[PDB]
Amino acid sequence: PRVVPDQRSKFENEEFFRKLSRECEIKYTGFRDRPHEERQARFQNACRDGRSEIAFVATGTNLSLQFFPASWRQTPSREYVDLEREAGKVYLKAPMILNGVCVIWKGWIDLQRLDGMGCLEFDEERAQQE
């Protein structure tokens, strides 16, 4: 769809991205006002459907994520939603165009705490076909 003329440059030089290109505290934000027990279920069910809302706590940057290849209901592969790689938590991959630059959101979340670590990656491959 729409991107700035020089994505990598923007991704590497701007504070918004840099402050987001290194593993930092992330936290699920779905059903914010509800019993933690339920939220935990919501999170996993949503993860199995390939979607979630995870905000970067430090900056309050909220993101709605889709765990599917940028290309494109249908269960996500273990590449975008991994429940094994590490018992207790789930590793997530989510492509998107953020502020005009193709990126990939990667991170994991503790199925118990519903908090975790994640960051943004420049998606070279996607960026060039745009």
Binding site: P1, R2, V3, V4, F16, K27, T29, R32, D33, E53, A55, F56, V57, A58, T59, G60, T61, N62, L63, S64, L65, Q66, F68, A70, S71, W72, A94, P95, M96, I97, L98, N99, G100, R126
Partner: protein, 115 residues
């Protein structure tokens, strides 16, 4: 479309929001997200707010759909607040494939009383 500002994305514009506003009070204007490049009608759009203090402010009617490049929000409303005059960064998600995300920093300050 009313008064508009650029978002941090080169593909979207959104309405100008009050610099400061009261918690749970209707906005002086209908919040609008305008898409520059083609975006099919029906495409879902959502708004989310946060900052260092309140990482994910509660919102009302923060979902809308495109109709001729414009996603008009019906009584969007900021319930959560920003606190110690620190304002919200809006996250606008346009659900194309993959989703397109546009941020609007220091878009609005939400306190309990307002101006």
């Amino acid at each position: 479309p009313g008064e508009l500002v650029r978002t941090d994305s080169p593909n979207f514009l959104c309405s100008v929001l009050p610099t400061h506003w009261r918690c749970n009070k209707t906005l002086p204007i209908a919040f609008k997200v305008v898409a520059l490049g083609d975006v099919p009608d029906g495409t879902l759009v959502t708004v989310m707010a946060g900052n260092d203090e309140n990482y994910s402010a509660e919102l009302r009617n923060a979902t809308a759909a495109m109709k001729n490049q414009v996603a008009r929000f019906n009584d969007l409303r900021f319930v959560g607040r920003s606190g110690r005059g620190k304002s919200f960064t809006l996250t606008i998600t346009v659900f194309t494939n993959p989703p397109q995300v546009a941020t609007y920093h220091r878009a609005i300050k939400i306190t309990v009383d307002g101006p």
